[PDB]
């Protein structure tokens, strides 16, 4: 503890968190139809179990995992299946994907949940498989199944459960409100995780730019001992698992290794809240919290949205587009993607619905690199982005891999501090995609 | 085509950097121009205009967009070359230096960000080698509006054409005078007792280059540049520390032969080279240890060629040599990654 800070890089972008983190979490009227993609997680894609025209209740297991590394899909609301086919996906390409379409009946009747009894009584494996049959996908961006992470963590020895409450992305305030209003729930979820993984204490960390969240967390968790609330600095690449681990524990996650090596596990606050809900009440992951902000939105807010709700309904709920949105990002400005259209659904990993106007989007006129070395002074991983970009532009991906293309996390600190405006992150993404394509080809060859 | 992130920026630009460097150079350039008078102004104007025109022609030939002219990469080089030249120099000296730098040194390699050598110092070295007589005629300070400096058309005849200046308007500086008097079997103390004053040399009341003469306004500009986070303190600190330490050791060993410390600092283009010229981003290391090595080597070479060399000042030669040595330093002193040791293999825990 007693954070080492360091980080060895980082930027201070405009937070813009004061225009949305005022109102409480709103609610959505039930939209007519929901589009649920069958791949809302990492790894394999779940297989459907219902047919067209079937009647399902709120919480039914529409799709099941084909392998260990997957996650089921649960019906957000009671209704009738109308399509098991192609649906638009929340991807920059705009291509379609396999997915179900559910017509909202409007009754909104819950299924007979399999509630547990005395959650602090059972062995860790039973709780882990209960989480597995809950749809938890780790709503922090990595969309990785929480059950696999917990099962792997139980194998080793864990000395600390680190709740990643440091929402660092600009314009995003979902974590702030979810921690202000659900402090008891997040503390109980942290306790349940600490029981699942035999550990010592939880070190729940929040950034210093959220005094209300810190006060609420400290008020909620002061009678139970090992629970701790920590104040990390206000840095952009601070929510990352590796950077937060280095800041709190003081060690470094070895390259090509997992967080369990240093005996620390990282979970987002929304993921821990979902785990707490699943363990205490048996409710699967059906809805989450998203942040709608930007200069083109009449009323920025945080909305509790069902999975599969179209983006257009979300925009209409918050008043409407008060002008022409130059960009419609899905997530923070440093990692968001351009939405092809407003009919795209909301996957479990969707974090924001930013509507950036012209005055918020900086102009960029690319120029030759002047080798000012401002990239090296901002990279959290201590790489040399200029050399990586030079080798990627020359199609020498092998040379770029030597300079740190393997360890890059695409945080976007490169292009933020570039005098001659260069899309360094675009180069890195293109090089990684080319490496993945070559790897796929050569693997198929075998 | 789809657009990639991030969708945020810090409003930085190359134009702002170059304009800030020119603004930092302005207080010393004004002091230099006022002290020497109209010929200095004419030389500076000619050098800057020639630099801009030749950059425009080179951009037109190579096909690059004309917006590259507006980033200040050529005006800064012209400014540095003009302030690095003798004050009462003919126009063709400045024009030839500008053509040799903007041209061979910068544009022949592709443009800004591609050249491996400092353009301004390359032009200065080429001018000194090709024309030694015109680059070793230092005019005494003749302040503007002093009743002794030439008028506005006599100064035009001085700068353009070839009218001989005078008998008595040209003197010797400090380093060259010391070396000559040492070759005149005089000890290194008598020379500095009656032929050098530190207070006047620090203010800038001595003959020299156009902007080199003042070692205080240049220091203020360099400090402001460091506080603006445009340059890194490693190179100036290393250069100044190395030169001062070597000079002090030489003075302590043989006081009657070596002069060091204040004399070495307040003489020649050491401060200007350390702050504004050796800190060229395109031709300097990108690491911290690399910058420290760059500065230490620059200081050592400058002092060595100053003391035992055949030149009275070798800031340009030291800078060019370290620019040549830069790529090896870049490829052998890369910063440590995350979760890896210095050698690069993964950490063990």
């Amino acid at each position: 503890y007693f954070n080492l800070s360091s980080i060895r890089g980082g930027v201070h972008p405009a937070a813009h968190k004061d225009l949305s983190a005022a109102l409480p979490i709103g609610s959505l009227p039930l939209p007519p139809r929901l589009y649920l993609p069958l791949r809302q997680h990492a790894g394999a894609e779940a297989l459907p179990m219902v047919a067209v025209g079937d009647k399902v209740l709120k919480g039914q297991l529409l799709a099941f995992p084909p392998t260990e590394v997957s996650a089921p899909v649960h019906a957000p609301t009671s209704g009738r299946i109308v399509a098991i086919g192609p649906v638009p996906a929340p991807h920059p390409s705009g291509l379609t994907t396999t997915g179900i379409v559910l017509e909202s009946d409007g009754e909104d009747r819950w299924i007979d949940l399999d509630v547990s009894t005395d959650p602090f009584a059972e062995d860790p494996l039973v709780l882990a498989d209960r989480v597995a049959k809950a749809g938890i996908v780790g709503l922090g961006g990595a969309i990785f199944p929480a059950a696999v992470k917990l099962k792997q963590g139980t194998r080793h020895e864990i000395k600390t459960v680190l709740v990643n409450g440091s929402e660092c992305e600009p314009y995003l305030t979902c974590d702030d409100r979810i921690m202000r209003e659900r402090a008891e729930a997040i503390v109980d979820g942290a306790r349940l995780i600490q029981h699942i993984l035999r550990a010592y204490s939880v070190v729940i960390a929040i950034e210093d730019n959220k005094p209300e969240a810190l006060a609420a967390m400290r008020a909620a968790a002061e009678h139970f001992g090992a629970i701790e609330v920590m104040a990390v600095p206000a840095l952009y690449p601070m929510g990352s698992a590796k950077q937060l681990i280095q800041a709190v524990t003081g060690r470094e996650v070895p390259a090509g290794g997992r967080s369990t090596d240093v005996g620390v596990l990282v979970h987002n606050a929304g993921t821990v809240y979902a785990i707490q809900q699943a363990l205490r009440f048996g409710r699967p992951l059906i809805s989450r919290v998203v942040t709608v902000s930007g200069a083109c939105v009449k009323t920025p807010q945080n909305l509790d949205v069902l999975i599969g709700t179209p983006v257009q309904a979300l925009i209409d709920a918050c008043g409407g587009l008060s002008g022409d949105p130059q960009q419609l990002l899905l997530g923070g400005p440093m990692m968001g993607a351009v939405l092809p259209s407003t009919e795209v659904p909301v996957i479990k990993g969707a974090t924001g619905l930013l509507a950036l106007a012209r005055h918020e989007l900086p102009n960029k006129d690319p120029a030759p690199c002047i080798r000012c070395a401002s990239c090296v002074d901002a990279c959290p991983m201590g790489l040399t982005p200029l050399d990586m970009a030079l080798y990627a532009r020359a199609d020498d991906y092998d040379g770029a891999s030597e300079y740190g293309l393997r360890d890059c996390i695409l945080c976007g600190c490169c292009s933020y501090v570039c005098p001659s405006h260069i899309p360094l992150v675009h180069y890195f993404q293109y090089a990684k995609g080319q490496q993945d394509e070559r790897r796929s080809a050569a693997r198929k060859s075998d | 085509s789809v657009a990639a992130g991030p969708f945020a920026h810090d409003r930085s630009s190359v134009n702002r950097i170059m304009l800030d460097v020119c603004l930092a150079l302005t207080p010393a350039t004004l002091f230099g121009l006022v002290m020497f008078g109209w010929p200095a102004i004419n030389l500076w104007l000619v050098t800057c205009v020639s630099a801009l025109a030749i950059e425009a022609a080179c951009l037109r030939l190579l096909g690059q967009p004309m917006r590259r002219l507006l980033d200040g990469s050529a005006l800064l080089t012209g400014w540095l070359l003009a302030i690095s030249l003798p004050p009462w120099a003919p126009w063709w000296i400045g024009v030839g230096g500008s053509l040799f730098a903007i041209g061979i040194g910068k544009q022949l390699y592709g443009g800004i960000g591609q050249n491996p050598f400092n353009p301004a110092m390359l032009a200065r070295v080429a001018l000194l080698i090709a024309f030694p007589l015109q680059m070793t005629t230092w005019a005494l300070p003749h302040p503007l509006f002093s009743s002794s400096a030439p008028g506005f058309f006599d100064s035009l005849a001085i700068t353009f054409a070839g009218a001989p200046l005078a008998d008595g308007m040209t003197g010797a500086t400090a380093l060259g005078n010391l070396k000559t008097e040492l070759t005149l079997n005089r000890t290194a103390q008598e020379i500095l007792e009656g032929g050098f004053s530190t207070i006047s040399a620090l203010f800038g009341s001595t003959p020299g280059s156009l902007g080199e003469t003042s070692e205080l306004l240049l220091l203020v500009g360099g400090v402001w540049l460091v506080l603006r986070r445009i340059i890194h303190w490693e190179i100036p600190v290393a250069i100044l520390a190395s030169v001062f330490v070597m000079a002090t050791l030489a003075y302590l060993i043989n006081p009657e032969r070596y002069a060091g410390g204040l004399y070495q600092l307040t003489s020649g283009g050491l401060i200007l080279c350390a702050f504004f010229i050796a800190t060229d981003p395109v031709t300097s290391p990108i690491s911290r240890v690399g910058r420290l090595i760059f500065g230490v080597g620059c200081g050592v070479l400058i002092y060595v060629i100053r003391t035992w060399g055949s030149f009275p000042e070798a800031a340009a030669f030291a800078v060019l040599f370290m620019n040549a040595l830069t790529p090896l330093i870049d490829r052998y002193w890369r910063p440590r990654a995350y979760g890896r040791n210095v050698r690069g293999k993964p950490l063990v825990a």
Partner: peptide, 11 residues
């Protein structure tokens, strides 16, 4: 398809 979609090199 989506799984075969990859980024285009920056201009």
């Amino acid at each position: 398809t989506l799984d075969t979609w990859r980024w285009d090199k920056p201009a």
